Nucleic acid binder design. Structure first.
Length: 50
RNA sequence: UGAAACUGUCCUUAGUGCAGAUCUUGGUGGUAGUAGCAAAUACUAAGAAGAGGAAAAAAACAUCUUAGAACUGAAGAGGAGA
């Protein structure tokens, strides 16, 4: 579970969803040690659902 | 170094000697990798093409298709004329 509210607290509004993608990519790099991260189509759509 | 013309003495002649004219024309510096590249709400994921996202996050990646999210808001960022 990624507590996304921690990362996006008091963030610029027009850069909230794009930064949600960047943070997740960073968490995959620091965990799986791979620099090639591919987002599922469903994950991207959910982030932008709001 | 350069590869085809030139020099010394005597007279004669003159478009004859430059550091300045905010001189004329051409070239080049320090400033300086500095000031900037900030109006028009906004981009994201997958794939294709390409030399052109690599990587100890080098955090950003132009074009096209699909999906999401959006703006002009019909006296329009639409469709047409002088």
């Amino acid at each position: 579970t990624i507590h996304m509210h921690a990362y996006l607290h008091k963030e610029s509004f027009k850069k909230r969803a794009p930064k949600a993608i960047k943070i997740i990519r960073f968490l995959a790099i620091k965990t799986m040690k791979t620099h090639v991260v591919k987002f599922d189509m469903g994950l991207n759509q959910f982030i932008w659902s709001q």
